[model samples]
Target: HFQLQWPGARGAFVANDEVYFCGAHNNVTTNRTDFPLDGSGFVSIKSGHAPYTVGAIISLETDADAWEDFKNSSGGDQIAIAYRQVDNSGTYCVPFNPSSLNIAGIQDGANATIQVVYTGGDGNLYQCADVTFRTTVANLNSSVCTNSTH
Candidate 1:
């Protein structure tokens, strides 16, 4: 599996405790409703430029194709997976604003894992992280957002 680059989220693998995208584990849900945002367990962007945006896609269905389907589909209570333009992308840790997310039916431990995708400065899609949501926010590794190679 590809580990995250610059920001340490790109193509990052999930924890062993995390559920896979295909839902082979038989979890009722595949997305966590309680993602954190208090510096701990926050998504950060770095080593990139302007004209980039990140999105958090939480889908009940398995596989990567589901994100495209979720993006294409319209109407009906939309899922929590949504995109936001990155006004700044330096060392800033973008906190997960609860009001900004559309987590309607997400449940703890039931959902698989959340996907964070973004457009890099190169104008290509960068699969950020495959993260598991947690009620208790975990401390981020200090080396993650730093300039040094991970």
Candidate 2:
């Protein structure tokens, strides 16, 4: 399995680390409903793969049911829409500039699973990382993220 960088992903996502080749092959897997909205689960560029383009959309969901309707959902829930390319590796950060889509429907001092979907440079929709959000922003930590760049 390959390693991930920024935003700090949790759990074991290395199993599906293969670099998706084309749009047709970039299918959405299960929801990564396991990361905090503060700054988790946003970045890309697999080994031997080209960097993702800027302006890509990064959508977040509170649960599997909502995640199922991500493509059609609008406002507040759509955490990130513009992909900010970083370090020429298709990587980017979350809580995008001027676009502060706070984590919705989440309660303080409680953990929740969330899903993330992003439009890749290949013009394909890709799904990665099924992680859990910590109790709160203060509780959010990336130390568990594998080889995370921080």
Candidate 3:
């Protein structure tokens, strides 16, 4: 597992540490109820991470069901989890992919067992470490449609 080192109480999160709109960004966003599952899910990336794009939405438009199954499910969606490196300068998250190769989907409502990428105390990138989050679906049991971005 990778060690995450953050400085000054770490704040909400480190530079590259992957993060979601936890619980709805303080009730305004409400954390998408479609994402039924919580604590370690997966994100399918249709495109690679951009240096300045912190919250890059994986263009799973073609894989909407995959996205739906992930976003709207009561359980966890199996997917390939990767992290952008911590040097995501202008980005909100990191920029390096820390997934050993890929994080596989095993079952529903499980832990997001993937290599994590977080910002270190030195303001660098670190990979490996157990990470998890809650997830919901947009459409349960829907067809794996392509979401335009595909």
Top candidate by lDDT: 1
Sort the candidates on TM-score, descending order: 1, 2, 3
lDDT leaderboard ranking: 1, 2, 3
Off by over 4 Å in 2: 1-47, 54-68, 71-77, 90-103, 109-125, 136-150
TM-score of every candidate: 0.48, 0.41, 0.23
Local accuracy of candidate 2 as per-residue lDDT tens digits, 35-70: 444543344433223344333233334333333334
Lowest-scoring 10 consecutive residues by lDDT in candidate 3? 22-31
Residue pairs with backbone overlap in model 1 = 9-128, 29-110, 29-111, 30-111, 30-112, 31-111, 31-112
Better of 1 and 2 by TM-score: 1
**Tens-digit per-residue lDDT, 1-150, candidate 3:** 122221011123333443332211111111121222432223222212323111221211212222232342334433333333433222132222323223344233333222223333333332222222234434332222122221
The superposed Cα distance between candidate 1 and the true structure at residue 79, in angstroms, equals 7.4
Candidate 1 local lDDT, 28-118, one digit each (tens): 2333334443334445445345545565554444343443433424634233445766554454344443334545533443233445555
Judging by TM-score against the true structure, name the best candidate.
1
Better of 1 and 3 by lDDT: 1
Clashing pairs in 2: 32-129, 32-130, 33-114, 34-131, 34-132, 35-131
